[PDB]
Amino acid sequence: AFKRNLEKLAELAIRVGLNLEKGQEVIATAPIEAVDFVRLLAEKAYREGASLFTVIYGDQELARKRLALAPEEGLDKAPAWLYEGMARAFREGAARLAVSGSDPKALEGLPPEKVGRAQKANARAYKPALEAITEFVTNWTIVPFAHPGWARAVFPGLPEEEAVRRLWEAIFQATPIAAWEAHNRALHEKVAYLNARRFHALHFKGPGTDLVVGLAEGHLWQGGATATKGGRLCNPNLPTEEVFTAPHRERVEGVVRASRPLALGGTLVEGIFARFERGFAVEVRAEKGEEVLRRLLDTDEGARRLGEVALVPADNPIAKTGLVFFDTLFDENAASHIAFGQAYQENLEGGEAFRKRGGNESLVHVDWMIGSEEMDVDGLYEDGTRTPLMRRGRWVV
Template sequence: MTLNADFEAKLARYAELLVRTGVNLPEGGKVRVTAPLEAAPLVRLVSRAAYRAGALDVRVDYTDAHLSLTRYEDGGDAAVDFLPEWAAQEGENLVADGYAFISVVGEDPSLLSGVDQGRVARRSKAVAASMRNVQRAIGGMEVSWTVGAMSTPAWARAVYPDLPEEQAVSRLWDDIFTVSRADEPDPVAAWNAHLDRLERLCTFLNGRRYAAIHLRSELGTDLTVGLAEGHIWQGGAETAKNGVRGVPNIPTDEVFTAPHRERVDGVAVASKPLSVRGQLAEGIRMRFEGGRVVEVTAEKGEDTLRQLVETDEGAARLGEIALVPASAPVARTGTLFLNTLFDENAASHIALGRCYPTNVQDGENPEALIAAGGNDSLIHVDWMIGTPGTDVDGVREDGTREPLMRGGEWVVGEKK
């Protein structure tokens, strides 16, 4: 795409946002950036912003999803299964050394759609097992982390298939800047006001101590999600164990907590397609009994979903319930981003697999986490079930119900 001064200014503000608000990099901090090759212009600006903030080191790992494609298409079974020990050790060393983590997404959401999904599932499970300690440390907020995005040609073509490539890339950038508040005159100030609103919602929900959340939608969702004992609602900014307060996802409009792994019952119907393991799953419907998925159907990608929930025992149970208003900025764009970072902030959603330890009191203790009903798994996959017609109730221990959302919008706490 053709760059201009206005775009370059917004891109610089976006990079500054990832550093100053996302990981809130302190003087003397260190940061590890993971990004697709096409994100080099953004990564360079992130590096500049980090060093201006006083960083000691900016370490960048570029990724190329097409190399994964070549492994699946041209590599043997041994290549699919091979993982060097140093890869996980490197991640663990970065965590131990206090590095913040910035991830930039922008991959083709259906790049692996033509690949043997059994091979993809096998490698995905192996990678997750290898990186388990790193993911637990990051999910447990031992260090600050954030996720941003880069408008790449492959992603933009998937999102806007009817537009010429250059227009599609430009349109996607406009949406990224809008929902990330990078087009505001002072993005950091805009984020501070937004984070205050999310904090007020979390305070309200934590004060109610609901036993369960019940969601119903016009698509057929009728799901009761029991909540873990001592659950904690979170959203917006989070304080890492090193004392740094950042924003893990940019954008973010969710408030979320941990379900009880054995107390989920009913039907969940997806309101948006899900990009998972390199392909799109559409028309998803899952039925839960006693916390476990007992039935999986989909119009597209059903085999991939079945393999997903069979990853391990916890993969067929929930690790997150998140509430998002239908009027959130991502939803207002009218764009289906085909990327979880964005689409999960357009609709209330649930996640299969691992819960966040920070969503349960004393959750950093694995035994306490499990005793409270928290779930453990190699995976954590969000998928969207909220709609503009979704009603959400909080259910008290005695069975009384209180409306939280009507028509997809908050009717309690902070409504804006």
């Protein structure tokens, strides 16, 4: 009944997510608590040509016991060898699947001073891997399934057996081949429009919002299926409903107010609000967790500037459920969003000529949603003429 779906999901993760070519290895990252799924995938991975399914499970309880028992000035250790190896594997042609779905409240009750000291070191070794993935070298994807740290957070509906029972079902909607085939087309179309009109800036307007997000010079809109070395499709993110590009470093004046909460690694930031001036967020605030957010955005200069503008129709699947998934992948594609920090260089058509064309450079990349069911969006040309792009959250084309 539902097992017939779970299958399709998995089946899909491969024939579409990775578009796995016969005789291609498949390294996969996943949570030690979803083995049963891994296998389900593997099976389908191999049924498609996969020559080797290697999975590296990541247990949180393992790290949980680390932070609480490991010696300080000792956490600075990282699985360098592993990661640096995964890189090689990637560059040599190995595909990269990755199951996502973590429990935000796993590191709860633990000194945040340390947790950082540990992750700041992890990312330090993982870097060469990330690069291999950020810069599409191999075909990678990200499928997600339940987790008693999700069904337990999305729905606070006692039944854990049943929370998953619900959540597992939400994913069967948010995630067929013939609907996805006509979805990547429906995207590449908007992505074609937005690139051709060659706007000068977008203008969000709604309850409490009024932002003029300028756009970078020779900017370039991304969205949907990506090209893998020459001509080869593959949907990196499974939920994917967004379209985006880099705004302009110094051209975003206005006031913009949050729509959906922002799960910033455990702590919950709600009702956030920011005021922009000549591209700089001169005033960031929030009903809850103001302290935390302000710190992250005080990292460097670029911290308080924008590096990504994204349009997500609020009539989409992840949106119809109307829930908080405290997960980037899921929330990011929930509703139109804006993001502070570094702008993916994959958005500037075509180091120093970057900061000139309008690219923003920083350490952090925070995405918070602002799009909603009452968010109207127009697109302006350099002269001021404005073409309607979105209304009450829906596309007008």
